Design a protein around this ligand. Structure first.
Ligand SMILES: CCCCCCCCCCCCCCCCCC(=O)OC[C@H](COP(=O)([O-])OC[C@H](O)COP(=O)([O-])OC[C@H](COC(=O)CCCCCCCCCCCCCCCCC)OC(=O)CCCCCCCCCCCCCCCCC)OC(=O)CCCCCCCCCCCCCCCCC
Ligand SMILES: CCCCCCCCCCCCCCCCCC(=O)OC[C@H](COP(=O)([O-])OCC[N+](C)(C)C)OC(=O)CCCCCCCCCCCCCCCCC
Ligand SMILES: CCCCCCCCCCCCCCCCCC(=O)OC[C@H](COP(=O)([O-])OCC[N+](C)(C)C)OC(=O)CCCCCCCCCCCCCCCCC
Ligand SMILES: CCCCCCCCCCCCCCCCCC(=O)OC[C@H](COP(=O)(O)OCCN)OC(=O)CCCCCCCCCCCCCCCCC
Ligand SMILES: CCCCCCCCCCCCCCCCCC(=O)OC[C@H](COP(=O)(O)OCCN)OC(=O)CCCCCCCCCCCCCCCCC
Ligand SMILES: CCCCCCCCCCCCCCCCCC(=O)OC[C@H](COP(=O)(O)OCCN)OC(=O)CCCCCCCCCCCCCCCCC
Ligand SMILES: *C(=O)CCCCCCCCCCCCC
Lengths: 128, 177, 558, 65, 459, 122, 155
């Protein structure tokens, strides 16, 4: 019939073409009502501090503080050296260093061999 | 799906929103006005063919392949209104929307440039601060246990009181400063 | 002699004087935009005298007036090159900018940051005439990065809007990718030729100049929105209308083309650079003109128009005809600035409406705007003996009659037809037919600022090709002998484009609804190129910028 | 007095903008017809393009052997 | 140099005998007078360095770092006086005394005629900086950085000490003037390989090197503003100064010992710049930018051409000014919103237009807008590394894209977009803060007029 | 443009290649062929600062036209006939290039029919 | 802020998972962490990688530009999925179909320029002829040496 839309990593499926959006069951009513309840409670807890006149400053958001503490602090104490961590720290850790090492060493050996054989046009090359 | 009051979309709301998005994407497909108006009555007939469908599972399936029809026939760049999100003039003046509390940080030599304005702003702030504790003690006795269920707020009940959580909605910046 | 160099420097110092005025302010201004417009009018009048006494004798010179630095063999001096390119570009740029600012005194009147806007626009003009007059690569890099940064600041003018900041950072990204190649060219000339000065580059005249010309072609790709580094020029329509009119149609975006025209003695002795310029220009002038066929925002359509004209400029450099390319720059400035001004006059009249599907019926509502939009479109397409005829047709008259990549010529002709297609598409959806805009008509254009600002570029778009092409000396030999099917090529292809697009436009009144074709989905989503690479190349950067770079190596292992 | 905004109908026009628009449209077609009447070769052709086959073997030096 | 050391020491009785409301004004005044005095060091010659005594000398490498050092003290006194207002008066004088003592150590670190006096003053600069960072850093969480400072002491300064004592026994002197004329070629041997690592790794960590930069987005974060200013502006540049002195003795083994570390920097500036695109912490973003700019100075010293030394010392002066101004802008928002999170306070051009102008100018100097000396240093290093290898321009130019990308992102996030609603303590800009931004930026802009005084001894 | 189809779709053996031609001697078929006279002196076009692409066998018309263009300032429409003279003689130079091309094509036809006559006869 | 609202190690027991989902302010059923391979994410919730461009724009947001609320557990790459950056939004044409059309178009245009460079078009003319030994002294020839005679003839 029709071409079915293919989702991707950078092209998500729409809300309309997802089947689980069309759930009518009461457990989905419970989950949606609890999400609405948590969101309404957090909205109320925010805008009681936001609309307060006696507060003049920053309504601190512990989800934001928790996000920054996860992006900075929680990186080392939850590390475990295993096969996956060591192989991925050896691929992107000492891989491209070795790559550019052999590339630049090859080109510099080529250029040195051409200079000591009188081949490289180093005529007007007096700034270096 | 994601709404402030309801936790979902009713089937009636889904039908109306799909009808509206179909007409908007159709008007994007069908630039001229008489031509779009002809196809708009044709599409209204197509939507009113199964308006009287009692079976909600069959109406669910019909709505699902109607979404597939709408996705197969959508315009790639539909007409977005300029101040609608995705428009060319959307959120353009947000760099001019200074919050009101910055008037509190003015120097008194320029506060004296507009005497009536700040002399009235003092009693606006007075109104806000003698309304605040009354609307807090209004919200604390009406909210159920576990917090409020829905994001909607109750209105001002007594005479003389103000509706709760009102200052940033009333004193919001104009859309064209 | 003492008149030429003096008024040459007086033009640039006069352009810098309102910057000192706006920086040394205490009062609120007695119409500072009028002051900057008066200053740029007088700077135009000042620069007219060296141009006239260049047309009299051919008088070129260099003003290496201030010694700045000496790195052991490299004497970097403040050096201004007054040649044919500066003498034809400076009056055209000042005339266009003067019309853009008299336009902006009407269009940008509601903006409370109008003095900052005119300040930034003057800063752009100063950096651009630093670019086009520079005699070494370093001062040219100063003007180059200056027009890049003022492009950033004038795209992101409504800095609260997310899309404007996104488009400005996008333009900076693609321009710095071009700057990779510009710095490659500077590095090659400093190492192999011991100079950044143009004179020693041209006098030494190297033969193994493939690598610096590849660097310059990458620089012109980043700057003139060639294929691969193009989409920032359609993205850059998120800025205001006089920004897109002055900078991103006529003045800034020709600077990669100007960089390649500036280095013509290296390109005329390197056939490989000519072939790469020809292929890249034909690819860009095909692709952007094809994308322009199926768009609905009028600023996007005229930006694809100016990028297709830049691709055609790259084509006519690539056939070793640089002076025709620069005549096409000086020609293109007038009618493309006028087309953006008339489109923005429609936009401001129709209450910030830019989508052509809600326009129409403006032939008798906005008569002067309709007149000038038709004249600008006909100068764009190559109507006989408008200004766009005196260069672009000659481009085809040298693109046919030369040792040329054949497919590049065929795509050049397809682009020539597509220009007529989107021009009559603009005239169809925006001027013809019956109205589609909303019901509260506030249509008005009766301001002497708007009318005179479109009027002077209208006089330019009518007479300037004739005047300039009869005032410039020969620098090549014009190939004037060809068969009649080859002489009548560009006109016939343009009229075939008009006929095909009129048939397309008259298929829209029919009461039929067709499913979208794959060509329509390809050209409407911009060859799928800003949809993929703007998602994929950031993703593969930023996860790699977080998972392995920050978290894995530089917080745990190392 | 300015142009009043109108509703669902044709907006007010000035005599001056209409006569200027007609004047520049007449200027466009005047200049097009003028330079087409005087040049007539930048669009059509400057010089005759000769036929190569219509050239004789003596002026080109083709001895038949 | 004794006309500079003695006024810097007289700033100690000036700061301890001053009246309690006058101790910022007096130290700022007399340190600005010392910074005006600091221009007498511009008596340089095209052949000879300016050689004062047996203990102190100044070529055109040490002179601009001295002027920047003596200029940095009044700016640190301006920057650090707001958040010390509720401090005890004696603790405030202790802070000012540690700043003065750090300047005192630095201005005879850069002029050290002999290399072990350079080592003593070089490792003497760490102690007042340590005390400033850990007594006024507003939070101290250094569980991983203790082991890294142990790694700095093991792999760094102690092999440098043993190597300098070895040169003292071999050459008979560590006078740099004598070592200009008594230098022997350091040939290929394993003894000379460990000699090269001992002479270089202390300064490699001080730059910092990529992979060894683990301390710098911690020590910049956990510090007060004066500590971050002196770390970004001067204390990284001790490594580059020491490399440019000690690579006299390391020829010709440097011509094949530079190849690993050059890779560590040429790829490293690709990574850390990219790291700046994913920073939640603004101060950490400026720290990784400092790593991404000192990688070029490491490469330019290791390739040891004239254009590379000129570009490296111009980049050192320019990056000192620029990154010090960036940390001061980060503090001028942190003193209002009380958090370093870069996504917290947005849209600040709607609220602070002149401060957003300072953000724009510091970003344009950060991304090397010509003709600024950031671009002059960047550009000369790029030219010299093109002469080293013609492929490296890719790794240069790609860096010069990403260096633009996080520079404007830092501008776009903090200053542009929509303002944050729940933050209402955003005060207008104090005249102190704008004066601090101008005393950073206006010298940096005036040095574009006359860059020849910051291009080192072989201009 | 038909010769492009003759060289690509047909054979390139009989079509003269653009890069290296004439492949035949200039006296081959021409009894006592004369040279091409240059009218403007080398020093005269040296002082006129002409482009190296413009110093062909008819640059003297260009020198007369540029002297007229200098001397008729500001009346920039007063020297149309000198431009016409230069364009007409450049046209004649292009005609001479066409004559060289047709000469080379007809001598390659002579060689083709010669070897076909030799294959038919011997 | 205090410790029991800060992130911790990987949740192993279900009651630690419940304590974290109460800490991260979301449902326990939606709360999934990143898998404990040792990559240092900790107990942070694996949000389903939706760009903030995809959100409801007309919804009353706490952070309107971010399209984000107060107290909502943010995405791990929230700095990456802002509307100034990486988007994951649905497109009218499929992702692989876009990649196929782009690669076929770009590679086919490259191949057609290679075909046209293989077969160049030209004019039915001879080479351009210049006097004075192919302009020998003009093109940088030395005045002491004398080249071969470059003589052109009338036709
Ligand atoms: C030794 C004597 C020398 C004398 C000559 C001076 C030499 C240079 C000195 C410093 C120049 C900059 C000074 C102003 C900037 C800083 C303050 C500021 O922001 O003020 C805004 C304010 C105006 O704005 P506002 O509306 O009032 O309020 C701010 C707004 O709210 C919000 O602001 P905004 O967004 O509306 O507008 C900000 C706008 C934003 O505009 C931009 O960001 C655009 C800039 C980049 C693109 C354009 C330039 C590209 C490069 C080409 C030009 C340079 C080379 C030219 C040479 C020929 C070609 C090679 O910036 C400007 O307009 C600044 C103009 C000058 C910019 C210089 C380049 C900065 C870019 C980064 C570095 C680039 C390379 C280094 C350049 C070095 C030049 C020497 O200016 C003032 O009030 C002026 C204050 C006094 C200034 C004194 C300057 C001299 C100081 C030195 C003292 C010692 C020597 C004695 C000389 C005394 C002379 C009077
Ligand atoms: C209203 C303002 C105008 C001033 C009004 C009041 C004064 C009246 C007018 C008369 C002025 C005085 C007489 C003329 C001036 C003095 C002339 C003179 O010899 O001066 C000495 C010199 C001339 O140079 P020099 O060659 O003699 O010496 C150079 C110095 N050494 C040798 C050590 C390197 O300086 C000047 O003239 C300074 C003015 C320069 C003007 C341009 C400045 C541009 C700054 C840009 C910075 C970045 C550059 C990057 C680009 C570099 C190139 C790529
Ligand atoms: C940084 C990583 C390397 C640091 C090594 C320790 C400091 C060495 C300082 C230089 C000493 C020197 O002169 O070396 C040459 C000397 C050579 O001995 P010598 O100089 O006495 O010998 C006489 C001279 N020759 C060589 C001609 C016979 O090296 C050594 O004696 C050993 C050097 C390595 C030290 C091993 C222990 C430390 C290991 C690393 C810890 C970190
Ligand atoms: C320049 C010369 C223009 C006039 C010569 C070409 C005339 C021509 O072939 O026009 C084609 C076409 C008119 O024919 P058509 O639209 O099919 O029939 C309805 C007639 N009103 O369409 C037109 O006449 C409209 C396009 C004209 C293009 C002018 C600019 C070139
Ligand atoms: C980790 C933190 C982040 C990163 C910071 C930097 C840390 C590492 C610092 C050192 C970098 C690597 C060592 C320097 C390499 C220089 C060239 C070299 O040594 O090549 C390998 C060598 C080749 O042999 P060759 O050099 O000829 O040896 C004879 C010398 N006369 O090969 C061999 O001789 C074989 C191997 C022998 C063992 C060498 C051990 C000493 C070097 C490391 C200390
Ligand atoms: C003549 C020779 C021609 C040679 C051609 C081949 C070489 C060049 C190849 C193409 C390189 C450029 C294209 C890929 C990167 C493009 C990134 C970009 O522009 O992102 C834009 C994107 C927003 O775009 P858009 O989706 O339109 O936004 C509006 C609505 N959201 O904005 C964002 O998403 C923000 C992202 C910020 C962080 C960017 C991370 C990626 C950085 C890419 C650096 C590329 C460096 C290349 C170096 C090459 C060296 C040789
Ligand atoms: C042989 O055909 C010589 C002409 C140049 C090459 C072919 C160009 C074909 C396209 C141009 C003419 C189009 C006429 C509608």
């Amino acid at each position: 019939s029709f071409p079915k839309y293919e989702p991707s990593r950078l092209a998500s499926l729409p809300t309309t073409l997802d089947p689980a959006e069309y759930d009518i069951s009461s457990e989905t009513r419970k989950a949606q009502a609890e999400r609405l309840a948590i969101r309404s409670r957090l909205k109320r807890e925010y805008q009681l501090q936001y609309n307060d006149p006696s507060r003049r400053g920053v309504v601190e958001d512990p989800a934001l503080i928790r996000w920054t503490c996860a992006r900075s602090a929680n990186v080392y104490p939850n590390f475990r050296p295993n096969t996956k961590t060591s192989l991925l720290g050896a691929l992107f850790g000492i891989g491209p260093l070795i790559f550019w090492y052999y590339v630049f060493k090859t080109d510099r050996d080529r250029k040195e061999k051409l200079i000591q054989e009188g081949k490289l046009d180093r005529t007007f090359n007096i700034s270096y | 799906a994601f709404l402030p009051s309801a936790a979902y979309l009713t089937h009636q709301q889904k039908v109306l929103q799909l009808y509206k998005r179909a007409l908007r994407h159709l008007e994007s497909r069908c630039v001229h006005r008489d031509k779009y108006r002809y196809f708009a009555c044709l599409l209204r007939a197509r939507f009113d063919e199964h308006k009287n469908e009692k079976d909600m599972v069959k109406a669910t399936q019909l709505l699902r392949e109607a979404e597939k029809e709408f996705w197969h026939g959508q315009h790639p760049q539909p007409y977005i209104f300029p101040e609608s999100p995705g428009g060319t003039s959307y959120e353009r003046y947000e760099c001019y929307k200074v919050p009101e509390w910055c008037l509190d940080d003015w120097h008194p030599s320029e506060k004296a440039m507009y005497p009536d304005y700040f002399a009235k702003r003092e009693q606006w702030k007075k109104l806000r601060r003698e309304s605040w504790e009354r609307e807090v003690k209004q919200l604390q006795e009406e909210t159920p246990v576990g917090g409020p269920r829905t994001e909607a707020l109750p209105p001002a009940r007594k005479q003389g009181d103000l509706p709760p959580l009102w200052w940033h909605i009333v004193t919001r910046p104009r859309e064209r400063p | 002699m003492n008149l030429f160099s003096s008024l040459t420097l007086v033009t640039l110092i006069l352009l810098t004087m309102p910057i000192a005025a706006i920086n040394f302010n205490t009062h609120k201004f007695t119409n500072y935009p009028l002051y900057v417009k008066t200053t740029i009018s007088c700077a135009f009048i000042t620069s007219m005298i060296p141009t006239m006494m260049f047309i009299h004798t051919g008088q070129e010179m260099i003003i290496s007036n201030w010694h700045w630095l000496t790195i052991q063999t490299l004497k970097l001096s403040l050096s201004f090159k007054m040649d044919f390119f500066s003498m034809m570009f400076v009056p055209v740029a000042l005339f266009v900018t003067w019309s853009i600012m008299e336009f902006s005194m009407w269009y940008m009147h509601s903006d409370p940051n109008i003095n900052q806007f005119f300040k930034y626009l003057l800063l752009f003009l100063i950096t651009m005439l630093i670019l086009v007059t520079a005699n070494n690569l370093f001062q040219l890099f100063i003007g180059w990065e200056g027009v890049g940064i003022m492009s950033f600041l004038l795209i992101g003018w409504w800095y609260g809007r997310t899309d404007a900041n996104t488009a400005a950072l996008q333009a900076i990204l693609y321009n710095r990718i071009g700057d990779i190649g510009f710095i490659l060219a500077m590095a090659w000339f400093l190492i192999n030729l011991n100079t950044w000065d143009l004179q020693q580059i041209f006098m030494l005249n190297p033969n193994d100049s493939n690598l610096p010309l590849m660097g310059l072609i990458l620089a012109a790709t980043g700057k003139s929105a060639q294929f691969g580094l193009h989409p920032w020029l359609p993205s850059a329509m998120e800025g205001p209308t006089p920004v897109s009119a002055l900078l991103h149609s006529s003045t800034m975006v020709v600077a990669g083309i100007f960089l390649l025209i500036r280095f013509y003695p290296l390109t005329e002795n390197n056939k490989f650079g000519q072939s790469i310029m020809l292929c890249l220009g034909a690819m860009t002038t095909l692709f952007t003109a094809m994308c322009a066929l199926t768009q609905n925002d009028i600023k996007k359509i005229i930006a694809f128009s100016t990028s297709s004209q830049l691709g055609l400029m790259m084509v006519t450099i690539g056939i070793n005809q640089p002076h025709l390319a620069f005549l096409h720059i000086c020609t293109h400035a007038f009618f493309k600035a006028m087309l953006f001004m008339c489109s923005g006059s429609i936009i401001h009249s129709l209450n910030d409406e830019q989508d052509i599907r809600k326009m129409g019926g403006l032939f008798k509502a906005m008569p002067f705007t309709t007149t000038a939009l038709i004249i600008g479109s006909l100068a764009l397409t190559g109507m006989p003996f408008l200004t766009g005829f005196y260069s672009k047709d000659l481009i085809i008259e040298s693109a046919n009659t030369s040792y040329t990549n054949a497919w590049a010529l065929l795509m050049t002709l397809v682009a020539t037809s597509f220009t007529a297609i989107y021009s009559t598409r603009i005239i169809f959806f925006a001027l013809l037919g019956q109205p589609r805009f909303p019901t509260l008509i506030n249509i008005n254009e009766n301001n002497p600022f708007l009318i005179n600002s479109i009027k002077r570029l209208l006089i330019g778009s009518l007479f300037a090709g004739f005047i300039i092409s009869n005032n410039i000396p020969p620098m090549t030999i014009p190939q004037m002998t060809m068969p009649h099917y080859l002489k009548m090529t560009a006109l016939t292809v343009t009229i075939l484009g008009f006929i095909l697009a009129l048939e397309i436009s008259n298929t829209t009144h029919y009461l039929k609804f067709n499913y979208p074709s794959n060509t329509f989905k390809f050209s409407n989503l911009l060859g799928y190129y800003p949809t993929i690479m703007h998602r994929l190349t950031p993703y593969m950067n930023l996860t790699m910028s977080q998972k392995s770079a920050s978290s894995l190596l530089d917080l745990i292992w190392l | 007095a300015h142009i009043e905004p109108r509703y669902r109908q044709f907006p007010q026009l000035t005599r001056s903008q209409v006569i200027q628009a007609e004047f520049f449209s007449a200027t466009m077609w005047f200049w097009i017809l003028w330079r087409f009447w005087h040049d007539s070769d930048a669009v059509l052709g400057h010089f005759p393009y000769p036929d190569p086959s219509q050239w004789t073997d003596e002026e080109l030096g083709i001895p038949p052997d | 140099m004794l006309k500079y050391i003695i006024p810097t020491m007289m700033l100690m009785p000036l700061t301890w005998l001053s009246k309690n409301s006058m101790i910022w004004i007096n130290t700022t005044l007399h340190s600005l007078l010392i910074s005006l005095t600091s221009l007498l060091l511009l008596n340089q010659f095209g052949d000879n360095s300016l050689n004062f005594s047996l203990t102190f000398f100044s070529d055109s490498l040490s002179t601009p770092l001295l002027i920047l050092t003596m200029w940095l003290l009044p700016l640190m006194l301006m920057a650090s006086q707001h958040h010390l207002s509720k401090e005890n008066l004696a603790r405030k004088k202790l802070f000012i005394s540690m700043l003065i003592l750090l300047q005192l150590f630095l201005i005879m670190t850069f002029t050290a005629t002999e290399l072990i006096f350079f080592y003593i003053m070089f490792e003497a600069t760490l102690v007042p900086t340590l005390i400033i960072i850990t007594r006024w850093g507003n939070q101290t969480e250094r569980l991983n950085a203790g082991l890294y400072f142990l790694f700095y002491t093991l792999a760094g300064s102690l092999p440098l000490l043993v190597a300098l004592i070895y040169i003292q026994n071999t050459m008979g002197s560590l006078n740099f003037l004598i070592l200009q004329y008594w230098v022997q070629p350091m040939p290929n041997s394993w003894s000379n390989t460990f000699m090269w690592l001992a002479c270089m790794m202390a300064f490699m960590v001080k730059m910092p090197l990529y992979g060894l930069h683990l301390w710098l987005p911690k020590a910049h974060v956990e510090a007060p503003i004066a500590g971050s200013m002196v770390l970004a502006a001067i204390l990284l540049k001790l490594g580059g100064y020491g490399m440019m002195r000690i690579t006299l003795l390391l020829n010709p083994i440097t011509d094949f010992m530079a190849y690993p570390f050059i890779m560590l920097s040429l790829w490293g500036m690709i990574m850390t710049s990219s790291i700046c695109l994913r920073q939640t912490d603004l101060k950490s973003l400026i720290a990784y930018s400092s790593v991404s700019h000192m990688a070029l100075v490491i490469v330019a010293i290791l390739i040891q051409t004239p254009w590379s030394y000129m570009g490296a010392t111009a980049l050192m002066i320019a990056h000192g000014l620029t990154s010090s101004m960036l940390f001061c802008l980060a503090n001028s928002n942190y003193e209002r919103v009380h958090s370093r999170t870069m996504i917290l306070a947005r849209g600040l051009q709607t609220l602070l237009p002149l401060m957003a102008a300072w953000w724009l100018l510091a970003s344009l100097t950060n991304l090397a807008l010509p003709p600024s000396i950031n671009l002059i240093g960047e550009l000369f290093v790029v030219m010299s590394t093109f002469s080293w290898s013609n492929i490296t321009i890719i790794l240069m130019g790609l860096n010069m894209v990403i260096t633009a990308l996080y520079s404007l992102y830092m501008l776009i996030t903090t200053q542009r977009g929509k303002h944050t609603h729940h933050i209402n303590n955003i005060l207008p800009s104090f005249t102190r803060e704008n004066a601090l931004m101008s005393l950073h930026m206006l010298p940096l802009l005036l040095l574009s007029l006359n860059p020849k005084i910051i291009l080192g001894p072989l201009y | 443009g038909a010769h492009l189809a003759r060289r690509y779709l047909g054979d390139a053996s009989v079509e003269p290649e653009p890069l290296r031609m004439p492949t035949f001697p200039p006296d081959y078929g021409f009894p006592e062929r004369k040279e091409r006279e240059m009218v403007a002196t080398q020093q005269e076009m040296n002082d006129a600062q002409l482009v190296l692409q413009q110093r062909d066998y008819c640059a003297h018309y260009l020198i007369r036209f540029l002297k007229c263009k200098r001397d008729s300032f500001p009346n920039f429409l007063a020297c149309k006939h000198e431009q016409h003279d230069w364009d007409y003689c450049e046209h004649l130079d292009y005609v001479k290039r066409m004559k060289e091309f047709e000469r080379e094509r007809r001598l390659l036809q002579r060689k083709k029919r010669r070897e076909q006559r030799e294959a038919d006869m011997a | 802020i205090t410790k029991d609202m800060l992130p911790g190690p990987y949740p192993k027991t279900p009651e630690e998972r419940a304590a974290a989902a109460k800490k991260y302010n979301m449902r326990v059923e939606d709360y999934e962490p990143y898998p404990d391979d040792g990559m240092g994410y900790g107990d942070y919730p694996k949000l389903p990688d939706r760009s903030q461009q995809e959100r409801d724009p007309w919804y009353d947001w706490d952070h309107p530009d971010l399209r984000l609320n107060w107290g909502e557990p943010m995405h791990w790459d929230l700095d990456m999925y802002i509307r100034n950056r990486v988007d994951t939004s649905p497109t009218p044409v499929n992702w692989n179909l876009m990649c196929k059309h782009l690669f076929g178009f770009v590679a086919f245009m490259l191949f057609m320029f290679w075909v046209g460079e293989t077969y160049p078009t030209y004019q039915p003319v001879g080479p351009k002829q210049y006097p004075y030994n192919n302009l020998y002294l003009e093109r940088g020839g030395d005045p002491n040496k004398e080249p071969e005679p470059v003589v052109h003839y009338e036709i």
